[PDB]
């Protein structure tokens, strides 16, 4: 079989609907994942940092 005769990929290849569908979907997915991870990371860092602030039993205003 000739190496010039490329195998069939039609079952996975998108039709000529829009050349940016794959890109836009992928970039939204990656962007939202980056977004929520940043928010998660921020909340996690603050959780630890705030554990070092004055505890509830030492705020005695006497």
């Amino acid at each position: 079989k000739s190496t010039y005769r490329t195998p069939n990929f039609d079952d996975v290849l998108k039709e000529n609907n829009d050349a940016d569908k794959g890109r836009s979907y992928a970039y939204f997915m990656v962007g939202a994942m980056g977004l929520l991870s940043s928010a998660g990371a921020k909340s996690t860092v603050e959780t630890f940092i705030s554990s070092m602030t004055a505890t509830a039993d030492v705020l005695a205003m006497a």
Binding site: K1, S2, Y4, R5, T6
Partner: protein, 431 residues
């Protein structure tokens, strides 16, 4: 003095050269490998060889003529060379081969002998010509299932299945007056040629238009022909480029000139004003590389080819090269653009102002078939000098930045990383 173009039924185009000592007359058809199918692929290449067959060449030689033929993707040519005086003898041979003869050249013994000849020819190319074989596979994967994917020499499978009838079918469908241009280059006048052509009569399939089909499409992909028994790794990589007559035709050619060509064994080549050279010479990442901007009627390919014995550092070769390409979009300098202009002009001048009539014949015919005329260096140079840094950045941001690539490689390519690692390098992280 400006290249004449006359039509009376048959479009005749000439380019008189007073300094030329020879003359070339021939016919260029606006059909090439891109007009074949996967099953008759190689038919044009077979035609070229029967035209250059001994019987046909001996006849021409007796008359003091030399035959030349070139099979391209968009076009096909058949040229006869002779002294400036024997210019009419060329036309007779040309007329004979494409009007009188038919069953003479397509005889059982000539066709079979020619077929056997191109078969061994193509087998040798696929077996030994690694850099060109790889470039052919780049086209194949980049434009797969599209006209532009077919190799110009044809494939062994389709070649061994070809019969005289296939040749005839192609000839009847493409060797037409409406799909042709008779060219005249070297030392010859337009009137001398037009009157000698207008001297004869007939038509041979008049008004008949060539067959039509579906347009070329670029597909981000790759084909890997690993062969660990070969001494090097040969790689070709490219993005969708510019078709002929594209508004960015020259901007793309200039962009390719920025990174240019290189031969590690040539002292002066190592001293070129190419920033990529600072990165690749320290650990000698390659033996050579050459950037290109291939242009066709429906599409094009912009990228480079390289050969290397440094099989453990292929990832660095590719990485540094693509990082340099990234620069065309964000930081290419004015001097890089100015150096490219000068060298592009020299390249075109060497291509168009070559001392070869056959070369001029091929270029003239191909261009007049596509745009009806041939652009002059004077106009080309003006367009080139008008290109700015902003034009290069605008073009790169469209064709290079975060764009799909086509890859082809053979030899010791274990070190060539996966598609995505290479594809990710088409851009840089930004804030």
């Amino acid at each position: 003095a400006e290249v004449t173009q006359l039509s009376n039924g048959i479009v005749v185009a000439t380019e008189h050269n007073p300094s030329a000592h020879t003359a070339s007359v021939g016919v260029v058809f606006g059909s090439g490998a891109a007009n074949e199918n996967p099953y008759n692929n190689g038919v044009s290449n077979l035609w070229k060889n029967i035209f250059l067959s001994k019987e046909n060449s001996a006849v021409a030689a007796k008359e003091g003529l030399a035959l030349s033929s070139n099979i391209s993707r968009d076009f096909q040519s058949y040229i006869v060379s002779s002294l400036p005086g024997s210019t009419d003898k060329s036309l007779d041979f040309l007329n004979q081969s494409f009007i009188q003869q038919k069953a003479n050249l397509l005889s059982s013994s000539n066709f079979e002998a020619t077929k056997k000849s191109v078969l061994k020819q193509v087998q040798d190319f696929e077996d030994n010509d690694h850099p060109n074989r790889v470039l052919e596979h780049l086209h194949s994967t980049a434009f797969q299932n599209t006209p532009l994917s077919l190799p110009t020499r044809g494939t062994l499978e389709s070649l061994e299945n070809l019969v005289v009838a296939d040749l005839e079918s192609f000839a009847n469908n493409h060797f037409l007056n409406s799909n042709a241009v008779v060219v005249g280059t070297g030392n010859i006048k337009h009137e001398d040629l037009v009157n000698s052509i207008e001297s004869k009569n007939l038509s041979l399939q008049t008004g008949t238009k060539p067959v039509l089909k579906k347009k070329a499409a670029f597909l981000g992909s790759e084909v890997r022909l690993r062969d660990d028994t070969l001494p090097k790794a040969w790689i070709s990589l490219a993005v969708e480029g510019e078709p002929v007559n594209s508004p960015n035709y020259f901007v793309a050619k200039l962009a390719a000139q920025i990174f240019g060509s290189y031969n590690a064994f040539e002292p002066a080549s190592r001293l070129q004003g190419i920033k990529l050279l600072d990165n690749i010479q320290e650990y000698q990442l390659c033996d050579n590389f050459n950037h290109f901007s291939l242009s066709y009627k429906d599409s094009g390919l912009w990228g480079f080819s390289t050969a290397t014995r440094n099989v453990t550092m292929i990832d660095d070769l590719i990485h540094f090269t693509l990082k340099q390409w990234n620069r065309l979009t964000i930081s290419v300098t004015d001097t890089e653009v100015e150096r490219a202009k000068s060298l592009l002009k020299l390249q075109l001048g060497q291509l168009y102002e070559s001392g070869n009539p056959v070369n001029d014949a091929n270029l003239l015919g191909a261009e007049v078939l596509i745009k009806g005329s041939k652009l002059s260096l004077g106009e080309a140079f003006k367009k080139i000098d008008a290109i700015t840094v902003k034009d290069v950045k605008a073009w790169a941001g469209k064709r290079l930045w975060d764009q799909d690539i086509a890859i082809a490689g053979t030899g010791q390519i274990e070190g060539l990383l996966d598609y995505m690692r290479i594809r990710s390098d088409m851009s840089m992280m930004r804030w």
